[PDB]
Amino acid sequence: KDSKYKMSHTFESRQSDAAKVRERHPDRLPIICEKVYNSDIGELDRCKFLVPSDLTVGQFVSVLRKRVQLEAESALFVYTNDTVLPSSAQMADIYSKYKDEDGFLYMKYSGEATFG
Amino acid sequence: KDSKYKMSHTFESRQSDAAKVRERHPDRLPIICEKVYNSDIGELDRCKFLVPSDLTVGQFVSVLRKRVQLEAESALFVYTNDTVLPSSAQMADIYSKYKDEDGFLYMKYSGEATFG
Ligand SMILES: [Ca+2]
Ligand SMILES: [Ca+2]
Ligand SMILES: [Ca+2]
Ligand SMILES: [Ca+2]
């Protein structure tokens, strides 16, 4: 399923937002983080992350985990372009390859639970 | 709740029309825009629109409003796949996802008045 954030904000406002992020906070990467449609995990009110460009996928996940409040016993996965991410990857490599035209990196997250 | 335009125009004349418009006008999306069945709003002679690719839904709705002659206080809604489009959606995104087999995006519109 498509991004609920993309849908509810105009491209021009999204593009200007992402560019104002990387100008005011040049050390950061503008990230949109939304729940995988399928999963039993809670949606974030504030799905925009200004992520230190020195983070690995694994570190951003730890940061994301603090917000979703998922039981630490449960795994948390993240996705760009419909493919799960290895925690070893550098957020800043994921950003440059997979960034949207508006300048945001759109990510999905899921725990281990799914509906069907 | 089906398309009058589709009934009165041939499939391969439609497909050929959409690609002709697309080649003559590269930055414009081919839209068929028809009234919701039960709405009190006027059809629309005149239902093909060559929409600038960068228009939001709300900018397209401003264009349609002038043509349909709906009072300012009165709301105007557009639909595709049978669901209301948000004003912040991009016509390019809606086109990409929802375009017909024949290459037109088929939309419907209504004001707030309906027949019981
Ligand atoms: Ca939150
Ligand atoms: Ca053009
Ligand atoms: Ca007309
Ligand atoms: Ca656009």
Contacts of B88 in chain A (CB under 8 A): 7-10
Q: How far apart are CA B71 and CA A37, in angstroms?
A: 39
Q: How far apart are CA A72 and CA B59, in angstroms?
A: 46
Domain parsing of chain B, residue ranges? 1-116
Secondary structure of A33-97 in HEC code, one letter for each residue: EEECCCECCCCCCCCEEEEECCCEHHHHHHHHHHHHCCCCCCCCEEEECCEECCCCCEHHHHHHH
Q: Name the CATH architecture for the domain at A1-116.
A: Roll (3.10)
Contacts of B56 in chain A (CB under 8 A): 10-11
Q: Where are the beta strands (DSSP E) in B10-63?
A: 28-35, 48-52
Cβ–Cβ of A10/B88 closer than 8 Å? yes
* Cβ burial, residue B63 (10 Å; 0-12/13-18/19+): middle
The answer to whether the beta carbons of residues A109 and A77 sit under 8 Å apart is: yes
Cβ–Cβ of A8/B86 closer than 8 Å? yes
DSSP state of B89: S
The answer to whether the beta carbons of residues A55 and A107 sit under 8 Å apart is: no
